[PDB]
């Protein structure tokens, strides 16, 4: 009966798809298809971040438009996650017609409200090119051990750290020209103005408990004006009334949630959704999985300017620790940085779902994806927990009783069992503790492959006059699979439509109470094979 609004970031045009960007993207889609199970109305939400000074560079040197460039990455992005089968309603991108107009829209309001403040700012400029440099397009010799070729604020020799106007002999990185200090009137957000209402809801006791510790390391530091526009040349949106300016990509980043959203109900032809939505009355609730590097923007910009534009607030942030592979950060020499396209060469979407749903809490901690382990664990839990209770049943049934399940249950108290469990497993998907779900399905796994040792099928079928026996034994155990299916549907978007397309029936949460009784199942090929450290090698060759 809720309304939902679910986003995760949105990822970078210029990069590819890894698989720290996938950690975030399942965790959300298997939240936000319990969600669905559930019988809720759900809004998956996303698009790609398409503007600012890297990307209108990079697309210069490729000698085409950025508008041609963002449009192949972002179809390339849609291609590996669609590959994912993260199941958004919407993916769209900053650089839109909707994107422009609520830009332009929140900063009107922003202004009009007193929340936009001039200053007047210095900064390294390239003279050749015409430009303001970035600092990391500024590259000269460090001014402490005198290192040459060091770019943008720190050096990787001595480890100093310094403005780059310290930088002895700077050059552009764009032209080779000696840049010169130059002035600019910029525009900047008063977000100091929030720090009572932001102060207020860190103490609410909503957002996770880490989350509001670093906080008030924020807040002890002192909030400052966070500037958000651009001089010219730029890739982006202009800045009403203010020619050679353009919105800084911290203005229209967040504000691509609010556009994927309206181009969605537009798409639709759905003119009431937007409003009832981000109006500031709404009753909907709006979620934005996030990584830690975005919790100070999430947590403290985007809230504010929301609020001085005079729309709702997120209900809440729900923010990931880090991917690491093999226990340390994803190392292009080891061939640890994997990229999404990469690792569907090798292994299946459905895997790296439960082993990262496997590891996931409520909290924010570091996910490490351990190769040896990924490899171990998918055939102890899938493979021979799981897809075993349908695999060591199907063919008798098939085979002796011509695909029919038994008339009725035959053990009721061991299936009570797993139906009671619906309430803690759904639970532990509702409070993201994943990994708590994942541990009280396997534990149920356990107890249904036991339950089959103990009857022993591959005693029963060879004995004489025993048929009912083995049609009642092998039924029970693939009731149990269709229950346990039924609490990883979440995870395993593809192996449920194969469990789906076996037991004849699509697999809904209330379902679960009605067993499969004088039941027509067909047969299946392979559900779930085995893999093997052999493909663990090949994937990291081809990353190196
Ligand atoms: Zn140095």
């Given at each position: ?382 493979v021979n927990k799981v897809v075993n209770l349908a695999s060591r049943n199907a063919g008798f049934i098939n085979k002796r009783f011509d695909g029919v399940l038994a008339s009725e249950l035959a053990d009721?108290?061991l299936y ?29 796994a356990?107890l249904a492959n036991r339950y089959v040792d103990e009857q022993a099928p591959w005693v029963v079928a060879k004995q004489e006059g025993r048929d009912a026996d083995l049609q009642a034994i092998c039924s029970m155990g693939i009731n149990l699979f269709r229950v346990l299916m ?12 194969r469990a789906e397309a076996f037991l004849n029936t ?9 067993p499969l009784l004088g039941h027509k199942v067909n047969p299946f090929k392979a559900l779930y ?16």
């Open positions: 009966a809720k309304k939902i609004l679910v986003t995760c970031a949105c990822p970078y045009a210029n990069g590819s798809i890894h698989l720290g960007h996938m950690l975030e993207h399942i965790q959300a889609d298997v939240w936000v298809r319990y969600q669905r199970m559930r019988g809720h109305e759900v809004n998956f939400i996303c698009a790609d971040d398409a503007h600012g000074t890297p990307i209108m560079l990079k697309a210069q040197q490729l000698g085409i438009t950025p508008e041609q460039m963002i449009g192949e990455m972002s179809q390339e992005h849609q291609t590996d996650f669609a590959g994912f089968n993260i199941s958004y309603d919407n993916y769209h991108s900053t650089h839109s017609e909707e994107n422009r107009q609520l830009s332009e829209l929140i900063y009107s309001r922003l202004k009009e409200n007193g929340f936009i403040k001039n200053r007047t700012i210095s900064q390294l400029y390239d003279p050749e090119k015409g430009m303001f440099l970035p600092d990391r397009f500024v590259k000269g010799t460090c001014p402490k051990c005198k290192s040459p070729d060091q770019y943008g604020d720190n050096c990787e020799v001595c480890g100093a750290t310094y403005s780059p106007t310290e930088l002895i002999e700077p050059k552009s990185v764009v032209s080779g020209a000696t840049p010169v200090m130059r002035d600019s009137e910029h525009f900047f957000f008063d977000l100091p103005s929030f720090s009572e209402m932001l102060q207020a809801w860190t103490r609410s006791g909503a957002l996770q408990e880490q989350v509001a510790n670093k906080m008030q390391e924020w807040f002890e530091s002192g909030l400052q004006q966070w500037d958000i526009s651009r001089d010219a040349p730029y890739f982006g949106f202009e800045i009403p009334n203010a020619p050679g300016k353009y919105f800084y990509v911290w203005l229209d980043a967040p504000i691509g949630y609010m556009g994927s959203f309206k181009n969605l109900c537009d798409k639709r032809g759905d003119s009431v959704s937007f409003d009832e939505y981000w109006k500031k009355d709404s009753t909907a609730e709006l979620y934005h999985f996030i990584g830690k590097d975005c919790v100070y923007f999430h947590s403290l910009f985007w809230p504010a300017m929301l609020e001085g534009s005079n729309f709702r607030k997120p209900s809440n942030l729900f923010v990931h620790g880090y991917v690491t592979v093999n226990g340390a950060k994803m190392s292009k020499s080891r061939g640890t940085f994997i990229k999404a396209s990469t690792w569907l060469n090798h292994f299946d979407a459905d895997s790296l779902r439960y082993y990262y749903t496997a590891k996931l809490s409520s909290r924010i901690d570091d996910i490490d994806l351990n190769l040896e382990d990924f490899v171990q664990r998918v055939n102890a839990d899938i009721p108290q009570k069992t797993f139906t009671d469990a619906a309430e803690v497993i759904g639970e532990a998907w509702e409070s993201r503790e994943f990994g708590k779900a994942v541990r009280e399905i396997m534990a149920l356990d039924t609490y990883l549907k979440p995870v395993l978007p593809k192996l449920t439509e699509e697999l809904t949460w209330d379902g679960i109470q009605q094979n085995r893999i093997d450290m052999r493909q663990v090698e090949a994937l990291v060759e081809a990353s190196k």
